[PDB]
Amino acid sequence: GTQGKVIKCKAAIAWKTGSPLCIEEIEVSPPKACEVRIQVIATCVCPTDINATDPKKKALFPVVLGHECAGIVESVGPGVTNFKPGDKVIPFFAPQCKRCKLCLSPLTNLCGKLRNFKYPTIDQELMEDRTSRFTCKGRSIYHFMGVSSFSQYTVVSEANLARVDDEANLERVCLIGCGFSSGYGAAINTAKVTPGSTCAVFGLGCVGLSAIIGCKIAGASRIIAIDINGEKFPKAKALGATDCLNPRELDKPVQDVITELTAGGVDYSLDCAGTAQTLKAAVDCTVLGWGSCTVVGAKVDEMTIPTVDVILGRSINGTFFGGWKSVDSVPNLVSDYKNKKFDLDLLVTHALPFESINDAIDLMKEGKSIRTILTF
Amino acid sequence: GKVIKCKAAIAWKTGSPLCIEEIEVSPPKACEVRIQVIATCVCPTDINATDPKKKALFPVVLGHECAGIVESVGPGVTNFKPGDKVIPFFAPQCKRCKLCLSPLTNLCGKLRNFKYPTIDQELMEDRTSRFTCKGRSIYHFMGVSSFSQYTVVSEANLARVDDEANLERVCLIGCGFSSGYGAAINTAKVTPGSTCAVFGLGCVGLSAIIGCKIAGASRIIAIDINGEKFPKAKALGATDCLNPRELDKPVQDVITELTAGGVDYSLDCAGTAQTLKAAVDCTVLGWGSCTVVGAKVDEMTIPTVDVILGRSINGTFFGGWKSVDSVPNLVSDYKNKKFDLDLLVTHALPFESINDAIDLMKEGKSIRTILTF
Ligand SMILES: NC(=O)C1=CN([C@@H]2O[C@H](COP(=O)(O)OP(=O)(O)OC[C@H]3O[C@@H](n4cnc5c(N)ncnc54)[C@H](O)[C@@H]3O)[C@@H](O)[C@H]2O)C=CC1
């Protein structure tokens, strides 16, 4: 518990694929040079974590999952001076070393720290010196996307976290760790929505809803929300959607319907679902000449685009953590919440003990929730 | 308004070559101009028309890249008179629709078919034709139909140019040069000091190299499977050249290694399934941009991971130029030697020998063959 000593605490480990999480007692070593050890206060489950338990996907085991959270600094490694015990922080999967070609360009938010560009979900699986800080029943355990928040205490790289306001409500600002930021920024930075434009958002979960918030703040005059589960519409409307459509209850392809309603198509579209049908429709429903499609979610490995479509004016791009330069922007999003610029409360549907983590996973797998807050 | 009797090339059906025939050309009506063609070239698009695998209409008068002079104008026309030099084109700018008014695109409300533009603008504004042969009415092609001594076009499809222009060279502005030059400048938006890659070294790709250089690029890589295309590439601005058939590793991997990560802008002026995939792969992460110009296949497949990691895709239409307003400017640049079009013309042949010009192109032996009368 105290500095320099190994800690023993609760956690949830995935011993192998296609299986539920087990509650165990583990040992968390102290931080080394350029590392920080955090006490996790609140955390949520994200579809990216569950995706790791899918047998048809690539992943490593045994591992400690989790990447959306908020907490407090317990101790820091040798030579560290930008962090100290007591400070409130928020870690993330997108690093910002501030010391590379990519970090210097205003055209991207990627960083030279990343190594795998074909399978990012298995990158950052160990610390810089290529060793692990986790141990359980003798065996060494893998880290997950540089965070691993499903443990009371974790250790991260200085390039993977930021200090925030001393009076921040950690049981809510934890949403800034992944979901909210990714959707909000996709609209503002990646798609670059403009005043008076028309937008279309596919998928109404935490990401899609945050994208609607972003479009409204950017000044769009019309926002069309699409989802196969109609029960998600009321919450979308409370946040800014002006129209709603269920592909399942329509006679014609949903894109043909959108095209009719707008007399040609929308200026900007964002896919926050990621299926073969949503990706195709997201492109189809934009106006020719200057229509823009931004990819956010992706459950499939590829998309097929007709050649005549780009020749006629349509373009395609995608986002990574909402396009935010992580270390510099996260503090600012926290300040915005303080000033009531947007309400993170509507994104929370459940609250439960960390012990019941497996129930939160079922709820999400059943589309009966948005986000569930877990606490130790 | 007399009817003119002249010669022209007609395609009667799919699967057979063009036939030289004697036809009748009617006088121009309101908002129309009758042009005397002085020089015309053959473009890959004209050849696709007779391929049974492609969609097309028959019988038709093909051709769409040329330069010429005004013979006569229709009732009420005042911006044109007999003797003026002009250049027609497939991308209209009617200036009486909503799209022409927008600074976000170069498309126009005059267009109707967006899945097969090669069969659009097949008749005039009033839905009738101006061509006749052996008692049969004949179709127009993409609003131009240049394979004829005389043709008639809508005022939204041409522009008057400098009185001293050399019509035997500025004809390239009608399609090929403008499309490649503009793809780099307007569509890809190449910037000073950047690195680019151009796939395909025919008229369009060479013009893209000319455009990259004028925009300020510091490095220009040229790729083609036919090595005889290299000497002209270097004469126009290429700094490095690569032939896929003489490399063991895939060409996109060679480009990535020679640049330590890839290029800032790529332009596909070939359009095969292999070039489209390579054009995307050879761009840098974070901000790499791929622009589609050529297109031999109907689709392209993009990996989800690539767009998430910063790569983007777009495409060009007549180089992004507002046709009526920009063509005259391009003619002026040539007059002032900003670039040199003479290097793009490799042969000349009498109009009656059109079929020999087509065979020359299908053997990869030429860039552009000018046809004269
Ligand atoms: N690009 C990046 O950096 C990030 C990507 N993501 C990804 O974004 C996606 C969304 O995340 P969440 O909102 O948290 O997930 P979620 O599971 O809550 O959202 C999915 C929603 O899409 C709907 N849907 C499913 N099939 C549909 C169809 N055919 N048409 C319309 N709607 C359909 C569902 O009914 C549901 O409401 C995930 O795939 C996630 O991994 C999350 C964070 C960052």
Ligand SMILES: NC(=O)C1=CN([C@@H]2O[C@H](COP(=O)(O)OP(=O)(O)OC[C@H]3O[C@@H](n4cnc5c(N)ncnc54)[C@H](O)[C@@H]3O)[C@@H](O)[C@H]2O)C=CC1
């Ligand atoms: N988007 C638009 O508005 C326009 C599009 N185009 C299109 O652009 C294309 C090119 O036109 P041109 O230069 O006149 O044709 P071309 O036939 O002379 O040019 C093709 C060139 O690419 C090369 N090539 C073929 N396969 C290759 C491969 N795998 N790797 C590298 N090089 C390869 C050939 O050897 C040849 O030199 C056509 O498909 C044409 O229809 C032309 C004008 C405007």
Ligand SMILES: [Zn+2]
């Ligand atoms: Zn996530």
Ligand SMILES: [Zn+2]
């Ligand atoms: Zn960096």
Ligand SMILES: [Zn+2]
């Ligand atoms: Zn052409």
Ligand SMILES: [Zn+2]
């Ligand atoms: Zn118009």
